[PDB]
Amino acid sequence: GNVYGPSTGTDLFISHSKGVFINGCADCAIYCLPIAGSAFLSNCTNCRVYVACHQLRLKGCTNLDMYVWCASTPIIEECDAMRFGPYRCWVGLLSSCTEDGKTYATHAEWVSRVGEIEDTARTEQNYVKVDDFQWVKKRASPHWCVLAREEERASTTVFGPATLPSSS
């Protein structure tokens, strides 16, 4: 369970692990190698985040663009101005490597082999459905939406060096 942040204005590189917690980051891009477990973000604002994971939960976040490959539906809580896109927008992952130097040619391979999500076909599109569970009114939640094609930020950024966790 690696803990990262708080941090402002510096791009973060989160290596593969079985769980991450990201607290109090602002005004940056966050590039995560696939996490074979849950990712929890709290109190983050104005960040662009690229993450693959088994579960994704966000609390107290505002103006996050989330590029996500998740085995389950992402959950938000006390969040607003959230926009969701696919992990494949991190084009630079494909020119990156694992800690052991392994490289894969597609995002599905990365997510299957490093993320340990076996059913890549069924999960890729989980980012279009978000569970804003405290919004119990009948109408769609106004707190999140899906990024339009032209608003996708297709990052060519290569991973590394890994950001050192604050704790574990």
Numbering used by the authors: 158 to 325
What is the paper's account of this structure, in its own sentences?
A recombinant form of this domain, comprising residues 152–355 with a Leu223Met mutation was prepared (LmTBCC-C) to allow the production of selenomethionine (SeMet) derivative protein. The strategy behind the mutation was to enhance the chances of obtaining a good anomalous dispersion signal by placement of selenium into the hydrophobic core of the protein fold at a position unlikely to influence the structure. Two polypeptides constitute the asymmetric unit and in each there are two segments, residues 155–157 and 326–355, which could not be modeled due to disorder. Although previously predicted to consist of two domains the structure is best described as a single domain dominated by a right-handed β-helix of five turns that form a triangular prism. The rest of the polypeptide is catalogued as the TBCC domain but it forms an extended structure, not at all domain-like, mainly positioned over one side of the β-helix, the C-face. There are numerous interactions involving hydrogen bonds and van der Waals forces formed between residues in this extended segment and those on the β-helix, including a tyrosine “ladder” composed of Tyr188, Tyr207 and Tyr224, to stabilize the fold. The structure of the LmTBCC-C domain matches to the human retinitis pigmentosa 2 (RP2) protein with an r.m.s.d. of 2.3 Å and a sequence identity of about 25% over 139 residues. A comparison of the structures is instructive such that we are able to identify, with some confidence, the β-helix A face on LmTBCC-C as the region for interaction with GTP and by implication β-tubulin. In particular LmTBCC Arg214 and Glu234 correspond to RP2 Arg118 and Glu138.
Tubulin-binding cofactor C stimulates GTPase activity and contributes to the release of the heterodimeric α/β-tubulin from a super-complex of tubulin monomers and two ancillary cofactors. There are five TBCs, termed A–E. TBCB and E bind α-tubulin whilst A and D interact with β-tubulin, to deliver each tubulin subunit into a super-complex comprising the α/β-tubulin heterodimer and cofactors D and E. TBCC is involved in the final stage activation of GTP hydrolysis by β-tubulin, promoting release of the α/β-tubulin heterodimer from the super-complex protein assembly that can then proceed to polymerization. This TBCC cofactor is a polypeptide of about 340 amino acids, located in the centrosome and predicted to form three distinct domains.
